[PDB]
């Protein structure tokens with residue numbers, strides 16, 4: 001799952017993808033905002 | 042305390058309480074003198090160290106006055122004055138670390154001063170011990186503390202800074218950050234190392250960078266910047282903790 005991090009429809013049957021932006025806001029200001037968001041998408 | 046057997050008597054513990062009150066007031070005005078110029082000569086330092094030794098000694102007496110759980114000793118101390126003198130001590134320490142955070146001149150007296158804080162709080166916890174439910178004397182101590190809570194902040198967060206930043210300096214923006222890891226890491230090297238950490242305020246980390254003392258070009262030692270007193274400071278903060 002180190003290779004599923006960037007994947008597009010990431011919770012394709014789970015819940016919601018807004019959690020990705022949520023944890024970007026948990027962490028991207030600390031380390032890389034545009035780096036880790038692009039690492040997700 | 043009591044000296045019951047004679048006709049008349051005294052309570053010598055109250056006498057030493059007021060003596061250290063006078064001592065406290067003297068040291069506080071010494072601070073008030075030095076609080077403006079802040080370029081402190083040899084003389085005031087070396088006599089001040091002797092005054093520090095007095096404070097150390099009288100706290101040693103105080104501790105051994107409550108060496109055991111001697112109760113009426115604690116009762117007199119609960120009704121004693123001394124808490125305000127402690128408050129003024131905290132007030133001294135709060136600004137005192139910051140002026141003493143600079144030079145080779147400073148660090149000796151700073152070491153003695155933080156030593157004195159450690160002994161004072163040792164005195165405090167030693168008289169603390171006899172509590173049961175929440176501690177009436179402990180309630181009194183809460184009154185003293187959260188009364189003087191503001192100057193507690195400076196010393197405690199100073200401890201936090203010096204502790205966590207001797208802790209950070211291992212690696213992963215430090216040891217690999219140069220080849221050797223001696224401390225040829227430059228000033229702004231460490232500054233942006235802190236920025237990449239993004240843990241602390243920029244103000245006090247760059248204040249630490251002001252106390253990095255400019256290792257002849259830009260660099261900064263690992264231990265000799267912080268650790269050599271920070272682990273003493275770790276002991277002290279352990280006591281207060």
Ligand SMILES: Cn1c(=O)c2c(ncn2C)n(C)c1=O
Pocket residue numbers: 014015016
């Ligand atoms: C999208 N979503 C949720 O977000 C969710 C949930 N149960 C709890 N949450 C929070 N279910 C069933 C769900 O479908």
